Design a protein around this ligand. Structure first.
Ligand SMILES: Nc1nc2c(ncn2[C@@H]2O[C@H](COP(=O)(O)OP(=O)(O)OP(=O)(O)O)[C@@H](O)[C@H]2O)c(=O)[nH]1
Ligand SMILES: Nc1ncnc2c1ncn2[C@@H]1O[C@H](COP(=O)(O)OP(=O)(O)CP(=O)(O)O)[C@@H](O)[C@H]1O
Ligand SMILES: Nc1nc2c(ncn2[C@@H]2O[C@H](COP(=O)(O)OP(=O)(O)O)[C@@H](O)[C@H]2O)c(=O)[nH]1
Ligand SMILES: COc1ccc2c(c1)NC(=O)CN2c1nc(Cl)nc2ncccc12
Ligand SMILES: [Ca+2]
Ligand SMILES: [Ca+2]
Ligand SMILES: [Ca+2]
Ligand SMILES: [Cl-]
Ligand SMILES: [Mg+2]
Ligand SMILES: [Mg+2]
Ligand SMILES: [Mg+2]
Ligand SMILES: [Mg+2]
Lengths: 356, 58, 439, 428
């Protein structure tokens, strides 16, 4: 009998992993604060990583990588990409971004803004805090005079980032989307991309000039269900899955999902996680980590993928819970703690070793 | 970029300092107070012991 | 030349002291009787080894050592063992009944009745010193004597020798070899009361040494003898600079200058490599790069913790054997590209390096193989606060129900001392948080 | 901390006490004349804990034998190891106590208690460092119960900084001499709660059930019951008597086992369970020892440990075996049954090992548990007590010796408080 503890009651994913583990009959759940666990499904804040791996006679595993928040806070994601030589200042798949406080980059942000003031070509940006995420605290603007004043009107740290003026638009609709990819990093630092992603679709035709239509410009699920009158028209829940998006790309643009988009996604995922591997790996450590991430991508008119955000505590889409959570158990949990006694994996392994 | 500094050698060994980057930015109580704490604790012991011996006398 | 007095308190302190003096004698070519043939100044001298050994008219080399235990059985093995001749009877001080794993019993009850004797025996050695420099105190956190008596002793040493430096070697409690459930209480009580009296303290977690002995020495169930011989190798690395010629860490004050910029944050992490089994038939000797790289693996640390998730205030590399600066600098350059070595913004990112050409000496018949080069890294990293967080959480669990508290109150200690001591540790954990972490 | 002074009081006290000295004398190589004819040097390195050394290098138990009747002590002189004991340590009256606590504690026993204390003092004065005392007695009679607790009170007055330890045999209607046992036991429990540091609860109910259900003895005698007691007593004193990595004493045992001063009643266990003249041909494996020692069927107190939580546990493995395998098994028990160990005392199970096994066994394990399920023992006695006390039945045997009903009411209350107190830490 293996043992686990549950310290995040609000996690839909790990609620289902808890159910699946109990239902095997070889995993018992203990109380939150019983230290004699094999598996910790941990809290989001102040997870006490320093107490893990000091219980003799127990291999201990946790569902978070200590240090993975360098990837998963917007401000720190930008610092990571700018300062790491693996992902240069010239990194071609991240939008040009600058960190800004009420350390700071305001005068270097304006120095690239003045190339656009002497430019005839595109000055729309976006401003965001790393976790003011209720659908709010997002300003689009053609100039900094509205941004810098708006950033000080809110309390916390913010990032100013290029707004992708010409995104790819699904027809019928002339409408926006982002892509959510679920990536599981195991204890051996295998990077596993889940084969099913999902497009979080806008249901309102795109653009005006007076941007303020958090519905056509912002594709968050909460924003579509409240402000969008057209929520649920083309696909239910404003969620287009891969079979349909592949089919559209074949019919409308004569390419596949794989070629036009997924290669770039796999490249980005792999480059991000291999960058931070030396800082977070648990390879020779006294406890072990796995983690599920949610990578969020934009696609432009040119079929170029851009990385928007990395979520360290993602929710799944409702159809997919069953399959993804069963995959977390097989790959991330039963790999360390094996059960007793034709498989095709739901993940694609990201490895690539080119010689030069 | 590694500057090697204050190299000192001798027959049994050598020592030195290596800098890779410069700095990025810029009540002991008396004998009496100790005695008046050990003695205080001893009084609490004697008190507890006398209380026990009062109880046993009852 | 400035002398250092070593003080070994409780079972842990005494047995580790034995191991260290055994080792020191083998390193300096001093026999069990105390004779040192290679010493040609008979009857005295101001050589570097005389920091740790005094000399008699008959050419006997006598440790500047005091052994203190509240029960006699462990020090009786010193009195009757291989190095019985080495020590003078007045150096070996014993009571009749121990502290029963109770800090309050070691500090208040039994401590009060022997403290004036021990200071008098310490004063006898201090009177033989031309320039007393200070003290090295060896003890457990978990024992009643190790914790209780040591904290009292340290308070007094500050009164009687206020200008002298005091260093600790402290064994941090591990359940896998501990005999007591109240070690978290004891550990926190002694840390609270000792903190202002110690200039620099090297913690050794018995968990780390136990597991090093498992993985690297192929020992199924490590005894204290196994643990202590490994610890003494490390203690020897740390002290080599005081007993040998050199220009790094030549005096107790320098440990503080080099490792402790913030006085309360005075717990450097030791990491040691290589640890290689004597029974291993074919061993490929490890290079400067491989052993220096080994100093950044948690599996080789004296406390299991993760330096990648904290910040450094200082780092010292102490090499023994076949090492030259060129190899060290080439190793360090390679290591800085591959690993996460973040210093605090108000210190230089750098390493003070000390090399002694004599390779490590091993005890004949022991578990450690001879090696051509070894290193001990001393780094003051905020990651060591993980150990404090583990210990404090255990303390919080027990103290929330007042479990075992009556045993301490019954020795004359007040309940408030628990919360006062625990508050100091909350402040200590927060100090480490401030220094080592960003929002 | 070396010398322990042993006291045995009453019929039960002296029968188990005699068997204890028989068993450990054989384990330490000592014969009925007190001459050492052993081979190992471990059998003498801490022989002074229980024995005084006399002229001719004879070993003499630091043992005082007390009773109000001469009968059982004359049987002890006649018994196999009867000549070992110091003759001056036989302290006995003539009246007997008639299974009456009041006679033992207030009338007949007061008359004899001072002469017992003289012998205690004589033994204590000779001690280089006295740890404290161990008493064997029943709680259901009059002498062991009533006088034994009077003695405990007096000894605490004169040696208030020494450890008091008891092996206290609890009465049961399955092995019952008289109906007043629940009265004598309840009156004794009050005393033990105030005046002992650690008490081994040896439940005659459990010893019977083990003899009947497990050892297949249809008609258990006191000898069958005492075979279980003497094996348990040997076991629990192992680390006091033998050198190992844990050289324990009565205080360290107390400090580490007792988190709250009143909750000092332990549940002992033993594995493998044997009957006298056993066919133990198959030595147990370390997993078997470990599984059995924690089994409720191996508990010497008739309580279900799954009805409470372990505050602390001490475990003694005896024989030649893998210390690694012992650690693994001991860790497996805790990790696989973790709800039954209070989380608010971290690492509350400690284990010792001794190379020398008891007689007749290659391997054995002894369990010492401080569990909150011991309240079951105390509730049982309390229910038996109340059934009689609500009608004042049989009280005249006690009022005749000067006792008042109020003293019964206080004893009932204190024992029910003890039960509530265990219950307080079972829920937490
Ligand atoms: N590394 C090491 N640890 C030890 C040794 N002896 C004891 N310990 C540890 O020290 C703690 C117990 O404290 P001790 O030093 O034995 O106790 P003491 O200072 O003698 O105090 P009392 O016996 O309580 O008077 C436990 O965590 C042990 O594992 C030793 O020789 N080496
Ligand atoms: N640089 C950019 N250019 C154009 N549109 C962008 C953009 N960055 C974000 N968006 C839009 O805003 C949305 C995401 O905003 P944000 O990155 O703050 O997510 P969020 O933290 O509010 C919820 P979640 O963490 O689940 O993604 C996307 O759906 C996308 O349509
Ligand atoms: N286990 C055990 N119990 C006994 C023995 N002798 C008596 N008893 C129990 O002890 C109680 C009677 O007390 P006893 O010791 O005979 O009275 P005392 O001589 O006045 O102390 C009853 O509960 C008996 O069941 C014995 O040899 N072994
Ligand atoms: C936390 O549990 C304990 C429980 C018991 C102890 C200790 C910690 N630590 C000791 O010094 C004394 N002691 C023990 N004392 C004796 Cl007498 N026997 C033992 N047998 C087997 C095991 C521990 C034993
Ligand atoms: Ca000389
Ligand atoms: Ca000072
Ligand atoms: Ca009379
Ligand atoms: Cl001074
Ligand atoms: Mg977010
Ligand atoms: Mg997003
Ligand atoms: Mg000790
Ligand atoms: Mg009888």
């Amino acid at each position: 009998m293996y043992t686990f503890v549950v310290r995040d009651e609000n996690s839909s994913v790990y609620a289902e992993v808890s159910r699946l583990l109990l239902a095997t009959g070889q995993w018992k759940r203990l109380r939150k604060d019983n230290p004699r666990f094999n598996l910790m499904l941990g809290e989001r804040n102040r997870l006490p990583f320093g107490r893990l791996g000091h219980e003799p006679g127990l291999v201990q595993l946790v569902n978070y990588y200590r240090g993975a928040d360098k990837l998963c806070r917007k401000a720190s994601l930008v610092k990571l990409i700018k300062t790491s030589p693996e992902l240069s200042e010239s990194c071609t798949w991240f939008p040009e971004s600058y960190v800004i406080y009420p350390t700071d980059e305001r005068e270097v942000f304006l120095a690239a803004y003045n190339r656009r003031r002497e430019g005839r070509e595109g000055n729309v940006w976006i401003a965001k805090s790393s976790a003011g995420a209720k659908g709010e605290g997002i300003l689009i603007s053609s100039e900094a005079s509205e941004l810098l004043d708006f950033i000080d009107e809110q309390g916390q740290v913010h990032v100013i980032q290029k707004y992708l003026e010409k995104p790819l638009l699904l027809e019928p609709g002339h409408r926006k989307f982002d892509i959510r990819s679920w990536v599981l990093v195991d204890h051996l630092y295998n990077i596993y991309l889940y084969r099913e992603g999902v497009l979080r679709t806008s249901s309102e035709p795109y653009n005006s000039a007076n941007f303020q239509d958090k519905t056509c410009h912002l594709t968050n699920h909460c924003i579509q269900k409240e402000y969008s009158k057209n929520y649920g028209r083309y696909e239910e829940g404003n969620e287009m899955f891969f079979e349909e998006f592949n089919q559209y790309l074949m019919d409308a643009l004569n390419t596949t999902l794989e070629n036009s988009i997924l290669l770039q996604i796999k490249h980005i995922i792999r480059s991000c996680l291999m960058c931070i591997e030396p800082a977070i790996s648990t390879k020779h450590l006294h406890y072990q980590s796995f983690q599920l991430f949610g990578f969020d991508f934009m696609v432009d008119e040119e079929l170029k993928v851009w990385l928007i955000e990395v979520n360290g505590a993602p929710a799944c889409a409702q159809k997919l819970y069953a399959e993804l959570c069963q995959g977390i158990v097989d790959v991330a949990i039963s790999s360390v703690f094996p059960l007793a006694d034709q498989p095709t994996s739901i993940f694609i392994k990201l490895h690539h070793h080119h010689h030069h | 970029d590694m500057e090697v500094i204050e190299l000192n050698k001798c027959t049994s060994g050598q020592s030195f300092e290596v800098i890779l980057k410069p700095p990025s930015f810029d009540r002991d109580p008396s004998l009496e107070e100790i005695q008046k704490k050990l003695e205080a604790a001893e009084e609490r012991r004697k008190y507890q012991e006398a209380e026990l011996l009062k109880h046993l006398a009852e | 030349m400035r002398e250092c007095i070593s003080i070994h308190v409780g079972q842990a302190g005494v047995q580790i002291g034995n191991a260290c003096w055994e080792l020191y004698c083998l390193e300096h070519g001093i026999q069990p009787d105390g004779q040192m043939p290679s010493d040609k100044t008979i009857g005295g001298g101001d050589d570097s080894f005389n920091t740790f050994f005094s000399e008699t008219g008959a050419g006997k080399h006598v440790p500047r050592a005091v052994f203190v235990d509240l029960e006699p059985t462990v020090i009786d093995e010193v009195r009757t063992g291989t190095y019985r001749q080495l020590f003078h009877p007045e150096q070996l001080i014993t009571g009749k009944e121990d502290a029963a794993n109770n800090y309050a019993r070691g500090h208040y009850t039994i401590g009060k009745e022997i403290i004036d004797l021990v200071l008098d025996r310490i004063r006898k050695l201090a009177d033989q010193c031309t320039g007393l420099q200070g003290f090295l105190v060896f003890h457990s956190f978990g024992g009643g004597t190790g914790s209780g008596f040591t904290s009292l002793l340290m308070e007094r040493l500050s009164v009687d020798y206020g200008k002298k430096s005091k260093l600790e070697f402290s064994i941090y409690p591990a359940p896998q070899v501990s005999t007591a459930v109240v070690e978290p209480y004891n550990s926190i009580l002694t840390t609270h009361t000792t903190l202002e009296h110690s200039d620099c303290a090297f913690m050794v977690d018995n968990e780390a040494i136990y597991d090093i002995c498992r993985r690297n020495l192929d020992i199924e169930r490590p005894t204290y003898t196994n643990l202590n011989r490994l610890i003494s190798q490390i203690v020897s690395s740390i002290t080599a600079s005081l007993r040998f010629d050199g220009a790094l860490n030549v005096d107790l004050t320098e440990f503080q200058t080099n490792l402790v910029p913030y006085p309360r944050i005075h717990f450097p992490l030791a990491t040691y490599a290589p640890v290689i089994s004597a029974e291993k038939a074919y061993h490929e000797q490890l290079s400067v790069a491989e052993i220096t790289n080994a100093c950044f693996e948690p599996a080789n640390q004296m406390v299991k913790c993760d330096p990648r998730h904290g910040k450094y205030m200082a780092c010292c590399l102490l090499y023994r054997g076949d090492v030259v600066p060129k190899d060290v600098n080439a190793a360090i350059a390679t290591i800085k590209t591959k690993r996460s070595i973040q210093f605090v913004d108000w210190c230089p990112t750098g390493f003070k390096v000390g090399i002694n050409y004599q390779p490590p000496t091993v005890v004949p018949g022991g578990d450690l193989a001879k090696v051509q080069r070894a290193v001990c890294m001393l780094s003051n990293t905020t990651a060591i606060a993980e150990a404090w967080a583990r210990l404090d959480h255990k303390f919080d669990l027990m103290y929330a129900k007042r479990a075992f508290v009556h045993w301490y109150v019954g020795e004359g200690m007040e309940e408030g001392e628990f919360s006062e001591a625990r508050e100091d540790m909350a402040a200590l954990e927060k100090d480490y948080e401030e220094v080592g972490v960003d929002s | 901390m070396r010398e322990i002074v042993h006291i045995q009081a009453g019929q039960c006290g002296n029968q188990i006490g005699a068997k204890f000295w028989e068993v450990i004398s054989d384990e330490h190589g000592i014969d009925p004349t007190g001459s050492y004819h052993g081979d190992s040097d471990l059998q003498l390195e801490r022989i002074n804990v229980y024995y005084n050394e006399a002229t001719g290098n004879k070993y003499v138990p630091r043992a005082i034998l007390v009773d109000l009747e001469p009968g059982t002590m004359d049987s002890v002189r006649s018994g196999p190891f009867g000549q070992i004991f110091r003759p001056d340590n036989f302290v006995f009256g003539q009246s007997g106590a008639g299974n009456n606590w009041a006679k033992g504690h207030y009338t007949e026993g007061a008359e004899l208690v001072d002469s017992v204390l003289d012998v205690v003092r004589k033994e204590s004065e000779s001690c280089d460092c006295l740890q404290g005392f161990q008493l064997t007695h029943s709680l259901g009679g009059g002498t062991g119960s009533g006088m034994g607790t009077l003695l405990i009170s007096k000894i605490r007055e004169e040696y208030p900084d020494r450890i008091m330890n008891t092996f206290s045999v609890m009465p049961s209607p399955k092995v019952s001499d008289t109906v007043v046992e629940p009265y004598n036991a309840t009156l004794s429990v009050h005393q033990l709660v105030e005046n002992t540091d650690e008490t081994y609860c040896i439940d005659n109910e459990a010893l019977y059930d083990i003899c009947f259900r497990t050892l297949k003895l249809t008609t258990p005698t006191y000898g069958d019951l005492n075979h279980l007691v003497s094996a348990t007593m040997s076991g629990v004193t192992t680390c006091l008597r033998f050198p190992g990595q844990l050289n324990a004493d009565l205080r360290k045992l107390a400090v580490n086992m007792v988190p709250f001063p009143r909750l000092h009643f332990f549940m002992p266990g033993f594995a493998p369970l044997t009957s006298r003249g056993s066919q133990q041909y198959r030595a147990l494996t370390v997993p078997e020892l470990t599984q059995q020692m924690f089994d409720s069927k191996n508990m010497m107190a008739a309580c279900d440990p799954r009805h409470g939580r372990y505050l602390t546990v001490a475990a003694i493995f005896r024989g030649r075996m893998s210390m690694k395998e012992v650690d693994e098994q001991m860790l497996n028990v805790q990790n696989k049954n973790s709800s039954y160990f209070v989380e608010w005392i971290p690492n509350n199970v400690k284990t010792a090992v001794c190379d020398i096994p008891p007689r007749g066994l290659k391997m054995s394990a002894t369990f010492i548990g401080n569990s909150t399920a011991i309240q079951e023992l105390f509730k049982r006695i309390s229910e038996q007590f109340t059934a009689m006390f609500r009608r004042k039945a049989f009280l005249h045997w006690y009022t005749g010796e000067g006792m008042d009903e109020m003293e019964f009411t206080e004893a009932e209350s204190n024992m029910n408080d003890l039960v509530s107190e265990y219950q307080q830490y079972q829920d937490a």
